[PDB]
Each structure stands twice: as structure tokens, then as C-alpha cells.
Amino acid sequence: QQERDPWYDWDHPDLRLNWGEPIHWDLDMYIRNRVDTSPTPVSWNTMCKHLFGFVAFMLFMFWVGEIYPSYQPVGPKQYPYNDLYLERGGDPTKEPEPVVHYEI
Amino acid sequence: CMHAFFKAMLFMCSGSIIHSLNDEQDIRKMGGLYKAMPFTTTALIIGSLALTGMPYLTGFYSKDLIIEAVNMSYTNAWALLMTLIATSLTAAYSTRIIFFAFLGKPRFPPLVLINENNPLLINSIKRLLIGSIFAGFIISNNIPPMTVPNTTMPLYMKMTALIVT
Amino acid sequence: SDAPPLTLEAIKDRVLYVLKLYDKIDPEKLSVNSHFMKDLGLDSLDQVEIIMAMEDEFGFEIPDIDAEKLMCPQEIVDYIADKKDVYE
Amino acid sequence: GGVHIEPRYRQFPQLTRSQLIQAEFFSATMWFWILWRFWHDSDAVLGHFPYPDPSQWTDEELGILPDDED
Amino acid sequence: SFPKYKPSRLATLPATLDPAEYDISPETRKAQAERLAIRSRLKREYLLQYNDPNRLGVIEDPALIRWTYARSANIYPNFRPTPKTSLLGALFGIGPLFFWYYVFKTDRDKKEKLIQEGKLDQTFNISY
Amino acid sequence: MLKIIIPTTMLLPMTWMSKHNMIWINATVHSLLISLISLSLLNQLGENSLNFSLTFFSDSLSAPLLVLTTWLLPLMLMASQSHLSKETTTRKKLYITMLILLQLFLIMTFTATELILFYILFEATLVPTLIIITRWGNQTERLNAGLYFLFYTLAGSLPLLVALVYIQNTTGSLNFLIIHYWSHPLSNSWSNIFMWLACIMAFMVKMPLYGLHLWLPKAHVEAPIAGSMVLAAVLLKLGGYGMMRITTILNPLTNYMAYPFLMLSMWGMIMTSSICLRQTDLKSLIAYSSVSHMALVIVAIMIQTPWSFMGATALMIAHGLTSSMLFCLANTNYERVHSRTMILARGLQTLLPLMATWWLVASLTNLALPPSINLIGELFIITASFSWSNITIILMGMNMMITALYSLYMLITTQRGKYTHHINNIKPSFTRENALMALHILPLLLLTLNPKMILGPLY
Amino acid sequence: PDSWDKDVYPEPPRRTPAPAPQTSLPNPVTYLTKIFDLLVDRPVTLAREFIEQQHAKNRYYYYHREFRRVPDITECEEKDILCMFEAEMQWRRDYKVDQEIVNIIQERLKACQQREGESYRQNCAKELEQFTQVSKAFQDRYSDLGAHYSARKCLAKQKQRMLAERKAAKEAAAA
Amino acid sequence: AFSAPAAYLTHQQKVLRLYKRALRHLESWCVHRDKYRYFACLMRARFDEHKNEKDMVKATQLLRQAEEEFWYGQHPQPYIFPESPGGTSYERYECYKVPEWCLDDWHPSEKAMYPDYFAKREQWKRLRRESWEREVKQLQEETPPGGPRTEALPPARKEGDLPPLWWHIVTRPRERPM
Amino acid sequence: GAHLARRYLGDASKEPDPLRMPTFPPDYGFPERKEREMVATQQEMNDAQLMLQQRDYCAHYLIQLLKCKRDSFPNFLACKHEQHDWDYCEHLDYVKRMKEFERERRLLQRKKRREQREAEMARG
Amino acid sequence: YRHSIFAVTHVLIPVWIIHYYLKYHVTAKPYTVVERKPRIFPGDTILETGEVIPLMKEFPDQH
Amino acid sequence: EHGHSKMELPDYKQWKIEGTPLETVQEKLAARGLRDPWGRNEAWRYSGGFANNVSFVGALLKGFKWGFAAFVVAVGAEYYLESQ
Ligand SMILES: CCCCCCCCCCCCCCCCC[C@@H](O)O[C@H](CO[C@H](O)CCCCCCCCCCCCCCC)COP(=O)(O)OCC[N+](C)(C)C
Numbered sequence A: 001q002q003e004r005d006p007w008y009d010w011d012h013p014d015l016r017l018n019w020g021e022p023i024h025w026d027l028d029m030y031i032r033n034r035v036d037t038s039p040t041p042v043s044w045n046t047m048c049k050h051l052f053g054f055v056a057f058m059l060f061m062f063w064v065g066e067i068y069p070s071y072q073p074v075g076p077k078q079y080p081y082n083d084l085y086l087e088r089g090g091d092p093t094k095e096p097e098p099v100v101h102y103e104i
Numbered sequence B: 001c002m003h004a005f006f007k008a009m010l011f012m013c014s015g016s017i018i019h020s021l022n023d024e025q026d027i028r029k030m031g032g033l034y035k036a037m038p039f040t041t042t043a044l045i046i047g048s049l050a051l052t053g054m055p056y057l058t059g060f061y062s063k064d065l066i067i068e069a070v071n072m073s074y075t076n077a078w079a080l081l082m083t084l085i086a087t088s089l090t091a092a093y094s095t096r097i098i099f100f101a102f103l104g105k106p107r108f109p110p111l112v113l114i115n116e117n118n119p120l121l122i123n124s125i126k127r128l129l130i131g132s133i134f135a136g137f138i139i140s141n142n143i144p145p146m147t148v149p150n151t152t153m154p155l156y157m158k159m160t161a162l163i164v165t
Numbered sequence C: 001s002d003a004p005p006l007t008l009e010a011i012k013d014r015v016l017y018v019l020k021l022y023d024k025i026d027p028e029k030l031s032v033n034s035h036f037m038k039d040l041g042l043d044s045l046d047q048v049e050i051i052m053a054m055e056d057e058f059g060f061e062i063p064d065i066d067a068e069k070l071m072c073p074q075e076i077v078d079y080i081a082d083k084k085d086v087y088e
Numbered sequence D: 001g002g003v004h005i006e007p008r009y010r011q012f013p014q015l016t017r018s019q020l021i022q023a024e025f026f027s028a029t030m031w032f033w034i035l036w037r038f039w040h041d042s043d044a045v046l047g048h049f050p051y052p053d054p055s056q057w058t059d060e061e062l063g064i065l066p067d068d069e070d
Numbered sequence E: 001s002f003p004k005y006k007p008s009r010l011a012t013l014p015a016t017l018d019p020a021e022y023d024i025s026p027e028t029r030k031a032q033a034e035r036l037a038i039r040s041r042l043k044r045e046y047l048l049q050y051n052d053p054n055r056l057g058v059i060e061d062p063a064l065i066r067w068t069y070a071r072s073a074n075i076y077p078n079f080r081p082t083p084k085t086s087l088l089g090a091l092f093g094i095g096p097l098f099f100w101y102y103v104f105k106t107d108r109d110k111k112e113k114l115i116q117e118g119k120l121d122q123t124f125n126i127s128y
Numbered sequence F: 001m002l003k004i005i006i007p008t009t010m011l012l013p014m015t016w017m018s019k020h021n022m023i024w025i026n027a028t029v030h031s032l033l034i035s036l037i038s039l040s041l042l043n044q045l046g047e048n049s050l051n052f053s054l055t056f057f058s059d060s061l062s063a064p065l066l067v068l069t070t071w072l073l074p075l076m077l078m079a080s081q082s083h084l085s086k087e088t089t090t091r092k093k094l095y096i097t098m099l100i101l102l103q104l105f106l107i108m109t110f111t112a113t114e115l116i117l118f119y120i121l122f123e124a125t126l127v128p129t130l131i132i133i134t135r136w137g138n139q140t141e142r143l144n145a146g147l148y149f150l151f152y153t154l155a156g157s158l159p160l161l162v163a164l165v166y167i168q169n170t171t172g173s174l175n176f177l178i179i180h181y182w183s184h185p186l187s188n189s190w191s192n193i194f195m196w197l198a199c200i201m202a203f204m205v206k207m208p209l210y211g212l213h214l215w216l217p218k219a220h221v222e223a224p225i226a227g228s229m230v231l232a233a234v235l236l237k238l239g240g241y242g243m244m245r246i247t248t249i250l251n252p253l254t255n256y257m258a259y260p261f262l263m264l265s266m267w268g269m270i271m272t273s274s275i276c277l278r279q280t281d282l283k284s285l286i287a288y289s290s291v292s293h294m295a296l297v298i299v300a301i302m303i304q305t306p307w308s309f310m311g312a313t314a315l316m317i318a319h320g321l322t323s324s325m326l327f328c329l330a331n332t333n334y335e336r337v338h339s340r341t342m343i344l345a346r347g348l349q350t351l352l353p354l355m356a357t358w359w360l361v362a363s364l365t366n367l368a369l370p371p372s373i374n375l376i377g378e379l380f381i382i383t384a385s386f387s388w389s390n391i392t393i394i395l396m397g398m399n400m401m402i403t404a405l406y407s408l409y410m411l412i413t414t415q416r417g418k419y420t421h422h423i424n425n426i427k428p429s430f431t432r433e434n435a436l437m438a439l440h441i442l443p444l445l446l447l448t449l450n451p452k453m454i455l456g457p458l459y
Numbered sequence G: 001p002d003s004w005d006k007d008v009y010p011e012p013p014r015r016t017p018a019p020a021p022q023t024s025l026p027n028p029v030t031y032l033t034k035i036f037d038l039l040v041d042r043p044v045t046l047a048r049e050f051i052e053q054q055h056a057k058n059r060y061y062y063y064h065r066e067f068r069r070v071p072d073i074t075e076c077e078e079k080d081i082l083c084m085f086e087a088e089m090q091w092r093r094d095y096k097v098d099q100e101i102v103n104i105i106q107e108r109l110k111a112c113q114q115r116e117g118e119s120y121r122q123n124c125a126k127e128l129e130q131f132t133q134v135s136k137a138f139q140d141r142y143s144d145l146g147a148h149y150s151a152r153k154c155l156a157k158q159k160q161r162m163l164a165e166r167k168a169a170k171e172a173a174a175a
Numbered sequence H: 001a002f003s004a005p006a007a008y009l010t011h012q013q014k015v016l017r018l019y020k021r022a023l024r025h026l027e028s029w030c031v032h033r034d035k036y037r038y039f040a041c042l043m044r045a046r047f048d049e050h051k052n053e054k055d056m057v058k059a060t061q062l063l064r065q066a067e068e069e070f071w072y073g074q075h076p077q078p079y080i081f082p083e084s085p086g087g088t089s090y091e092r093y094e095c096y097k098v099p100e101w102c103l104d105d106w107h108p109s110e111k112a113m114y115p116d117y118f119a120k121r122e123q124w125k126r127l128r129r130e131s132w133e134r135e136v137k138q139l140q141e142e143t144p145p146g147g148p149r150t151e152a153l154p155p156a157r158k159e160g161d162l163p164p165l166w167w168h169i170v171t172r173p174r175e176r177p178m
Numbered sequence I: 001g002a003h004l005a006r007r008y009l010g011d012a013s014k015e016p017d018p019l020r021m022p023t024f025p026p027d028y029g030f031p032e033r034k035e036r037e038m039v040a041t042q043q044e045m046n047d048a049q050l051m052l053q054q055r056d057y058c059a060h061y062l063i064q065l066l067k068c069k070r071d072s073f074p075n076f077l078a079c080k081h082e083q084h085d086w087d088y089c090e091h092l093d094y095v096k097r098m099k100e101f102e103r104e105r106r107l108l109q110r111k112k113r114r115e116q117r118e119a120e121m122a123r124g
Numbered sequence J: 001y002r003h004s005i006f007a008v009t010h011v012l013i014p015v016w017i018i019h020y021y022l023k024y025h026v027t028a029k030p031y032t033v034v035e036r037k038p039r040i041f042p043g044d045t046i047l048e049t050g051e052v053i054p055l056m057k058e059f060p061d062q063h
Numbered sequence K: 001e002h003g004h005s006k007m008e009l010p011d012y013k014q015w016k017i018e019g020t021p022l023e024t025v026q027e028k029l030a031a032r033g034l035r036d037p038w039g040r041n042e043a044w045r046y047s048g049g050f051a052n053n054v055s056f057v058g059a060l061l062k063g064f065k066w067g068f069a070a071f072v073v074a075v076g077a078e079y080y081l082e083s084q
């Protein structure tokens, strides 16, 4: 119903219908508020290929970036007290294996 | 917080333009408004500069730090490239808006009804103008630190946001 | 909005202004009632360009079925007044 | 709550001096703010801490032996 | 020559690209004339019943009544059990039920097995 | 409990001895007074129950249902006042008598210490509703609708009587207290399986369970407004109440018995919500929405967890109120248009703004907008189902999205757009209709302030 | 406030820093809180004192209800209905009390997390560990009972748990 | 909109419609006015070359490759006037349009306000009541037998007569009632 | 970056994996190995409750900066020197991390050179 | 004059009710209002106790 | 209070293609034997205050002169006050 003439003087301007005319079985499917079948400047198949192609390419590039990350020429960040053992979880009655940091 | 200010002001300028041209929204039918209506012009220019992370502007204190933090983090290369291209495209459509709305010859219908002389519009726009000029500095200098800074950086990596913009 | 309430005189003046800016038609010869094909010797393509110029002048667009049978400036003004509900 | 301005019909619209002076003042304020901030805080853009060259460091501080001890 | 436009179900063919409109015959003109004739008769009837000052009610529309009746009440008397209807009904009315039953049964069997083995870690799980 | 029952009985002689022009006023006033008396029952204890006598008890599961039942009658009278204007005094008195008898049967059903008394009243409610549907009905399909409504219920509930008499012959009692205290597990046996089916199917058919819901659209569409109100508000909750009362003896058989019904309800909520998207009738759409809500209530009862039970009680109350309001709005439109078709009367917000506000509030409440009790029940049941299995979340989310979709579709189709040109008999909304909508909607927003009143005995 | 017990709801001493102004600029916070005091806290205090004296003019009391202990389900006969009723009521009351104990522990945990700020992961180990014990106990006692819970089902669950524990202990000792 | 439609479109009308569509989309492509003037004059020159062609077959073969060329380069986002069926304000004010018969249901306290307006409305009602009875017979006598062949209505031919079916065309609410 | 290209287009074993660094013992280079120092204790650093990711070797300057920021409140730019000290200390930490990365890279270089030299000697 | 009555009926009255509601009813129950603990830096003193936090370990200051 | 002031249209003889890019358009059109029939209709867009344009860099540098002068004055005052 979206692609009906918007300049004809319909009895129902919003639905673009004429009194007494046969009504399409799926009228409530096409009420200009729902799926429409208006022709597009670009073909359906080309649109599908372009949309799908872009998405597939973006996903595969993101996976490649996961495989090949980016970082800086630095070592790991160092934290003083046994890698902050007491303030991360706690467990003060186990005496963990100490870790000591290398000064250069 | 920064985007709130400058994007709200950008919509204010767009709405003023739309109202002044008889509810016309398309940019193909708006031409030379830099002189025909200058307060909206300067507000939109300041908002566009703020949006593009111009130095010492509301958008600087957030967007520049975003770019710096993404550039020096163990993340995807693709995501970083997409972010840089997005920044370039941001500058690009800001330029598109300014060029097609303010620079050329007029393209609106002959009956000119352009008018800004209303105190409500001027005051509302100028309050957010002052915000989009100074709030970034004020808020950044008033809040306590919450993350480790990126003190030392390669020179080309420090300028990358400005270069792409 | 702040739109002045345009009148019939303004519509006629604007239509005649745009028509006099049309170099194909001589300014002296044209009259409110002057016909297009016969009184001024214009083509149908000239008529459709005149309709487009009216459309660009008044900021609203006329359907093709109505436009194709608008042949005088007087009835163009009448159509515009009927569309925009002009009193006087 | 504004003043009366009539349409112009194909001529440049009437402008109030107040809006012109306000726009010019605000643009000048924005540019002055940028210049003032760049003058007082230049390190916010160019940086303040030089980036060291890793290849320029001598092998002494890096704990390197001449390929024979270990 | 320019690349061709290929229509689909949800992107129909433009009116100006129909070869049918270019194949003009007197029969086609007569068909269009009688189509507009019946349309004009319907419009005349509607406007005559619409502009009447005496009418103070709803103009009953037989087309709307037929549409609703066919959509709601005319289905079953025209139903005939066919291989297509039987197969589609069986699929669309039985398949989802067994699919979801299999999915939920497998999930719950896995969860019960983990609970019996004791390796699920249900700490702080108080409300159920 | 007799302090409620006796005034309801005295409503009959008062109605039959009233003046020809004073039946509605007296009935409404005394029904409202009876409702006020019913409010005292809400006070409930965390302990066993309010055991008034050997015949009747009250509980925090029965109390909200009783309050809703007593509150519904004045609204039904207000709705029925309009279309019965050209009716003789005797027939109007008969209509009021049918409504009063239905209320009395429901009131005695909800207390019902003993299960055979519960069955007797649960079946006695069938006659006044049938008479109302098949006597004061507008269309010619009311007879077929009444036949469907009668025979579905009776076919479902006849094995329940045999199951109950067998249970009493074996155990020795059908008093709910003794049944609860002396409960024993059911062994996985074919006889026990069929006893479970006979105990469950009678309440399943009246929920209605998906696939056994055919009677509901017919009965709701062909009934007068008062009949639709009572059917959507109270009569659907009888099955849920019965299941909640009877699932105490069906353990541990219910753990695996529930799967066929759980799958049916979980898929049928999606099916009926999708059906609501393509519907040309307001009443049919509202009926199918009721089917979806009751299917989700069935899921809650079958899961059989405390959160499930609380959510089911809250959702039952909220759905009753919301469906009654929606049916009343549809009837207000119908009495003006006489069509009962969505697409005929359009853009009614321009002509009737306050009624459009009522439509918006009713649609928002049906959409389960927080913090309404509709969403309280919805969310409790969703959480319980997620604890039952993490995969239910997909179906629950699909149902929520489709529910919002068709609710706003129904709102937009009727209230927004351009008015129909040829319809010119749309008079301003009367004070009666506005008061009806207000009395439907205000209790919901007051109950959301005290949700513990409708969360059932497991709160 | 005496309205609640400090032992049931423990709080740290709440040590607070002292104002140490480093500059001569007058901060606005102190001036704003002084004007807030003058314009808000004084009339509110006066109204509260008036209401409190009006309450003191009419004083009356209410009492906590005490419940006696009754035999539990473990010492009730198979078909004895009266003792079963009493034991069921007692068990339901105990269930409510256990729920409220868990509520108290959860409130303690939430208050600790909010109060400790950025160091909550270390300074609230005690509350977390108490909540771990209480949740484990509560879970053992009442989980999986179902909607139709009773003292008999809880006793059956406890019985099977003790049978499993006894079997495990016997198998471990005889290993 | 106002004019009644015909059973079909002739070749000349279709050619005009394509010319208008092509000019509009060329203006949409060419934003600037001087560039649009240049390319529109070039379009007119390319367009009127086959003006004087005579036979029907080649004329029908033309306009068809023209429509295909138009569809290939149709500027998928053309400029649209705000009030057009695709504009940003197509049906913005349709919620403010109230029918005229709604005034018949106003309370007498409301009708006490605006007495002159309601007196004029009653005069209009009387005029319509007489004119309709005249119009029914006029249309009955004027219509061809077997039903109308087009949805075009005749004007009034007598002195006191009014155009048939005039009430709902004259009494439109407004373009912008509020 | 240049290390990204060297690793992903060149030899992966030639350069370290940042996830698993360092791959060599701290004393492999020289036996002195002076230890890093902490000025802020546990209790005061907990009381300042900076953040877990801010609880690094630079905590003392951060505590002093917060001391200013709390003390000279209305003058939100009074202590700029403390910000400078904190930034300088973080810069020193970062350049230490770069030195660690460079040292590990050259240790890997010399290691690989070692086993290829042994391979050449063995083949000879 | 319009602003003065507005500042009383729309700001002063609501803040009076809320302050009374918070100071005497909400805080009557425990844990209802929980406040983030104030930060403690070296060199500070406490009003309640009066003790002074010892200073830090005099780090080597340069640049 | 609305704008009812009887606005009068200018004279149609005022608009001339001369001095506008429309003249260049006509010069190009004449090389192919063509002419624009609507050339004078659009001449008002290049005639009055619309005759002068501003570049993008000039648009961005809208208030650079006054801001720069104020910055110079302020930095001079800062230098003359700090060196004391
Ligand atoms: C139509 C719209 C919906 C209406 C409502 C539908 C709901 C009713 C469905 C009834 C629920 C299931 C019934 C019985 C479930 C028990 C589980 C059993 O079926 O599964 C296997 C049973 O195996 C086989 O299924 C045996 C039964 C085969 C015969 C049944 C017919 C199958 C399809 C009939 C469906 C018709 C439904 C509609 C009737 C009009 C398990 O193997 P087994 O360990 O050995 O038996 C365990 C039970 N014991 C311990 C008592 C022995």
C-alpha cells in the first residue's frame, strides 16, 4: 500500500484504499506501517551481496586483528607487594610464593 | 559529559537553521548563511571544532585521551585502524555540514524570513557555547585522577589524532 | 512559524514577477489572462518549466495531473490560493 | 520577545548590530582561549617527556655479555 | 546500455519499466476504460451516500465484510486434507515441540548429572 | 466467611423487589459495600490459614481472588447498564440474578475446605455463564460458542470427579488440610500417571493450555461485555487456583509429567503472541493475549518453586484487571461503531483524548511496564524459569518483544492516524465509561505500592 | 542511635580527617553548609522537639511476643495430627527467623562494601566469609524443598544427608 | 489531486512526466544553481532532438531506454518538498484536523461562546439541506445510463443550484488549523 | 611500531611474546640486581585507597598530589608541581619497562646466535 | 517577588520535609544511609581520637 | 502583533546576468548553440549581500584577529606583572 498513488483522492487517504474495492488478503501486512514492496534504486540481490560482503569482511578482519594484536615495546607492569597479593583476594594465612621485581 | 554539551548545541544550531528556513531540512536548499545569520554560524563552528577534538576545547580533554589510550594498549590492530578512520570521517562530515550549510550562494526560496533576534534562542545557545568552550578544562582540572597517565609517547603517535583530523 | 498571511495580490504579483523573469515570454505581451500555447506561442516543455519555476518560487509542489492543465497565470493563481486557503 | 523584522524578497535580510557584535565577541573569546591555553600549557599537545631511543642504550646497562660467558 | 534492474518479491518492478504498458492494443484500452468505469461507479455510490445530510451513521462496506469473513470464518469449510496441508501442519505443529523438548531435556540431564557428581559450585544460590 | 456470603445472597431479593428504575443503583451500591467487607480478608498470617469453620477457610492465595471477584461485579453492572436499555424489567432482573449467582458460586469456590465441594461449585459456575453467553449475545455464533465452552470444560473435568472419589476412597479424606499434612509420594506407575492426568487436565483446559484454547476466542468474542469481563478476569484463574491446590499430592510424579505441558505452554505463548500480530478483531486479539499470559502462568505453576508461585499469583491478579479494562475499552468503541473491526474506526485520539489516555495506560500495563505488578509476576516467573533452565530466556524474551509489539500495534491502529471520514456518530465519552476505566486502572497502581498483598502464601 | 543494637550491626569507629586549609581563599562548601544549617537544620530540630514533647505527653508501650518451645516433627507419631500441626507451625517460624538472619548478614556485607570504598576487596573479607558460612548452612537446610515445603520433607533431606555423611565416613575410615 | 484521473496516460503525458522527473533529479544531483542551469539546458537540448519524429514505433522505443537510463542514475536520495508525500512534514498537521460535525456535539455552555459562528453554521446547514435535494435529482437526470464512465462531476446549470457533492469539498478543515 | 612488522613479517622466535615476558632469569645478565624500593607502606596506602591499578611504585607522589588536591580545593591549580612529580615518576617506570623489553630482546638475540654458532660448530 | 515565593514553596518546603524525613526516620534504622569512608593521608589528624598519622619515608626528592 | 507591513517587490528589471557565473554558463551554452531561458530568474542569488563569499579557512578564522590582539595584550600584562 505504500507504493499506491499518493495523489489519487482516496476515500481513506491514510490506508490509500477506495470504498468498495476488493481488499488484498494480506492488507494488514502492508499498511505503510509494516513491510513494503516499493522498488529500490539498487537491485535486491546486489544489495544483499554488498551488505553480506561488508559484514563478512568486517568479521574476518576482526578475527585477524585478534590473531595479530598491537602493543608497545614495553615489559609487564610491576606491582610491589607480591603482585599486590593481600589487596587482591586476600588469604593472609597461606604465605604465597614471593615475587620480586627487577630494577634495571 | 563533553559530548552532551557540544552535541546538544549542534542540534540547537540545526533546529534554528531549520526554523529560519520555513521547516526546510535538506542541505541542498540552504546556501549562504555565514553572514545572513551569524550567531548560529559561530555557534555551529565552535561546536564543530569541539566535536573534532580541537586543542584546548571541550572535545579535546576527552577525545584526545581516547585516541592516546587506544593507541598504546594491547588491543586489536583492526579496531585501532577503524577508530582512526572514524576520526577522519568525523572531521570530514563536520566539513560537509559547514560547507553545504554556510559557504555557498543562497539556495532557499526567494521569500526571506531569516531571523535570529529572539532572546530565548540566543541565551539558550550561548549558555551551551560557554559550556562547550570552558567545561572541559574546568571538569578535567577539578576531578581527582582515576587512571594511570600516558606520560611518554612517540612523537608521531602523540600527533596522530591531529594528523588524521 | 512567523509566516505572513500571503494574499491573492501577493500570489499574482509573484507569479507575474517570475513570468516576467522568463526571457522566452515578452513582459509587455503577457496578461493575467494571457494563454500559454496560443497567446504567447510557448511549447508544452516551456509550460512544464514554468510549473517547475512556480514550484521553486512558492516552496510547494503541484501534482502532475493538476499541473498539466494549468494554462493561464490567472488559473495558476487560483490553484495556489485554493491549495493554501487564501481568503482575499 | 524579539523585535519586528519584515521579509525582504530576494534581498539580504536585515541584521541587528547586537547579534553581530555578540557573535564576533564569542568567536574572539574562543580563539583567545585557545591561544592562552596553548601559551600556558604547551605540553598538553607536544608532550613534556622525551621518548628514549632503545637502540641507543649501551649493552652495559642492559646486562649483555660478549656472547662467550653465557 | 546500462546495468539491468532485477526485481524481487520485496522489491517489485517499477511501473515505468513494464513492457506490458508499451504493448498497447484496443483490447487493453477497453479493459482500462471499463476498469475506470467500475471504479467511477463505486466512487459515485460512495460519494452519494457520503454527502447525504440525512445519514448519521457508518457507511457499511461490503468489501471489508468480505475481507474479515474470508480471513476468519471461511477458512475451515474450504479446507481439504491434502499431502501439502498434512505435511505442513505436522511439521509446524509437532517439530518445534519435540525440538524444544530435546533441548531442555538434554540441558536438564546435564545439570542433574553435574549436581549428582557435585561439580557445579552452587554457592550463594539461595532463591529458586 | 458468612459475613460475605449472606449479603451476596440477599442481593437477589433486593434486586427482585426493587423499583423498575432503581435496580442498577441499588445493585451497584450494595455490591460496592460487599466489596468493602471483603477487604478485611486480606489481612493474612504467615502461619497456616484463616480457618473460619469446617466448610470454609481463607488464605493469602484465596484472599486477592475473592477481593477481585467482589470488586468486579459493580464494574460489570456499570458496563451492562448501556446495552440493556431497551430490555424489559424482568429480563434485566434476570441478568442481574445471573451475575449475582456467578459471584456467589465463585466466592464459595475460592474458600472450599473440601475438594468435592470445590468441584461442585467449580462446575456450578458453568451454568450462569452459559446462560449469559447464549441468551444476551448479539451474534448467531453465540450458540456454537456456548456449546464449545460447555463441552471443553465438561470433557476436561469429568475424569477429575472419578480421580477425586478414588483419592477419597484410598486416602480417606479430601479436606485440604489433612491432604496437605498426610501427603505421600506418588510412585512412577501407569495408574499414577493416569491419576495425575485426570487431576491435571480439568484445570489445564480452563487455563486454557495451548492446543486446548479453542473455546476461549469463541466464548470471549460472542459474550456480552459483562460475560467477557468475568471470563477474562476470574474464570480463567480457577484453573490456576485448582492446580496450585492440587499439585501437593502429585509429587514426585510432576517432575517428569510436566514436560509435555511445559513445552506446549512455552511454544504456545510465542504462537499466540504472533497470532495477535495478525488479527482483525479487538476482542480476538485481547483473548489471544489472555491465552499467552495464562500459558506463562501454566509454566510458572508447573515449575513449582516459591518464586514461581508468587509470580503466578501476581500475574493472575494483574492479568484479570488488565484484560477487564481492555475488554471494556473495546466495548466502548463497539457501542459507537457496531462493527468490532480494528481498521474501521481510526484516529480516535483526535475525537476522544481522555479515552485515548485510558487506552495508552491499559496498553502500557498489558506491555508489563515497571513497576507494575504485571512485570512483577512476569519477572518472578522468568527468574524461576531461568533457574529451572537457562535456555528458557530466549523464549521469554521473544514473548516479551512480541507482546510489546502487538500491544502498541493495537494502540496505534485505533488511536493514531487519520479519522475515518464517513463515521460521524462518535459522541463524546460519557462519565460512566470514564469512571469504569478509572475504577479499573487505579487499583493496579495502588496495588503496586503493596505488592505483598498479591504475592500469595509463599511470601 | 539507641534505636538499634550496635553489636548486631557493627560499625568501625569512623575516624575522620581534620580541615587543613593550605590557602587563604575561602572555600564555598563551609559557607554553604553554614547557611544550610541556619535555614534547614534549626526549624527541623525545633519541629522535632515539639513533636517529641507532644509524644512524651502521651506515652504507651508495646511488647515483643514470646513463643514457647513445642515438640518437633522428629517426635511425632505417624498419623498424629495435633503434634504434626504444632511442629509444622514451629518449623515455619524457625524458617522465617533463619531468613531474617540471612537478611542481617547480607545487610552487613552490603554496608561493608559501601563503607570500605576502593579497598573493599581486602577490608571486607570477614563479612564475606561469615556470609559464606550462613549461606552454606541455609542452603543445606532449605534448598530444593519446592513450593509445597514442610517439616517432614526437611527431615527427609536431613536424614539422607546424614546417611550419606555416615557412609562416606565409614568408607574413609575403612579405607 | 483535485482533477479526476483518466483511463490511461498518452505518450505526450508520459514524456512530460519523464522530463519533469529527470529535471528534478538532475537538480538534486547538481546542487549549485549555475551548474544546474547549464545541465538543464543541455538536458532540454538532448530532450527536444526527437521532438519532430513521426512514427509511433520508434517513439515508443524511445522514452523506454530513457526510463531505463533514468532508473540507473536516479539519485537514490532526491530532494523532496517538506509537504510532499515523501517530505519531512508530509502529515505533520493531520492530527489537528477535526471534522465539522464535531461541533454538533458541543455542550450548550460551549455553544454559548461564539454565537455568530453557530448562527452562520445553521445557515450553512439550511443551504446544504435544500441544495442536496436539488443535487440528487440533477445528478440522476444528468448521469449517462448504465452508470458513470468517469469520476468527473458536472457543475450547476440553474440559477439557485449548487455544484453536486460540494459539502465535503467546501468544508475542508484547513491546511494548518492549529 | 616497527616491532610489529619485525615480528609478524619476520621471525617470530627472533623477538619476545609480551604475554610471557620475561623469558630469562633476572640474574642472567649481571649478579648485582639491586631491588626496587617502596616508600608508601601498606597501611597508609590502604587508607589513601587510591585504586588497585594505581597501587604501583609511584604511589607516594600520587598521595602527595591528592594531599594538595584535598587541601587547596578552591584553587584547583595550586599544586602543579606534585602533578609534575607524579608524571615524571610514571615516566621513569615506563622507561624502565622499555629497558626491560629491550634487554629481553637482546638476550634472545644473543641466545639464538649462541645455538646457531653451536650448530655451525657441530656441523663442521 | 515571584522568585521569592517560588524559592520557598518549591525549594525550602521540599528540603524541610526531606531533611526531617532523613534525619529522624531513615537514619532511625541501621545501614540505611551508608557513607563512603573519608580518605586518610599521612600527616592528617582525627577529630575523634586526636592522634596524628606519621609521615612517609622521606623519599629522595629530585626533579 | 504580526508582520502586516505591505512588503513591495523590487523591479524585475534590476536582475541582470552580468557579473555572475550565469554569464559563464551562457557563454558555454552559446558555444553549442544554446541559451538559458531562466537565467535572470536566479540572478538575485549573486546580487546583493550574497555577492561576497567566505572561504572555509576564513570561516574557521572568524574571530582570530580580536582574539589574537587580546591574547597579546594579556600576555604582555602577565609578563609585566610577573617580572616584579
Ligand atoms: C491435542 C492438544 C494438547 C492436549 C494435551 C496433551 C498432553 C497429554 C500428553 C500425556 C503426557 C505423557 C503421557 C505418559 C508419559 C510417561 C512417559 C512415557 O510415555 O515414556 C516412555 C514410555 O514408553 C512408551 O512410551 C510406552 C507408551 C506407548 C503408548 C503411548 C502412545 C504414544 C502416543 C499417544 C499420544 C496421544 C495423545 C492424545 C490422546 C487423544 C518411558 O518408558 P518406560 O520406562 O517403559 O515407562 C515409564 C513409566 N512407567 C515407569 C510407569 C512404566
Ligand SMILES: CCCCCCCC/C=C\CCCCCCCC(=O)O[C@H](COC(=O)CCCCCCC/C=C/CCCCCCCC)COP(=O)(O)OCCN
Binding pocket: F152, F155, F156, F159, F162, F163, F166, F190, F191, F192, F194, F195, F196, F197, F198, F201, F205, F212
Ligand atoms: C480436554 C479433554 C481432556 C480429557 C481428559 C484427558 C485425560 C483423562 C485422564 C484419564 C482417564 C481416566 C482417569 C483415571 C481416574 C483416576 C483413578 C486412578 O487413577 O486409578 C487408576 C485407574 O487407572 C485407570 O484405570 C486408567 C484407565 C484409562 C481408561 C480410560 C481412557 C481414557 C483416555 C486415555 C488416553 C487419553 C488421556 C490423556 C488425554 C490427553 C488430552 C486429550 C488405578 O486403578 P486401580 O486398578 O484401582 O489401581 C491399580 C492397582 N490395582
Ligand SMILES: CCCCCCCCCCCC(=O)SCCNC(=O)CCNC(=O)[C@H](O)C(C)(C)COP(=O)(O)O
Binding pocket: C043, C044, C045, C046, H011, H012, H013, H015, H016, H021, H022, H023, H025, H026, H029, H046, H047, H048, H050, H051, H052, H053, H058, H059, H060, H062, H063, H066, H067, H069, H070, H073, H074
Ligand atoms: C538525472 C536523470 C537522468 C536523465 C535520463 C533521461 C533520458 C531522457 C531523454 C529522452 C528524450 C525524449 O524525449 S524520447 C522521444 C519520444 N518520442 C517523441 O517525443 C515524439 C513526439 N514528442 C512529443 O509529443 C513531446 O510531447 C513534445 C513534442 C516534446 C512536447 O509536446 P507539447 O507541445 O505537448 O509540450
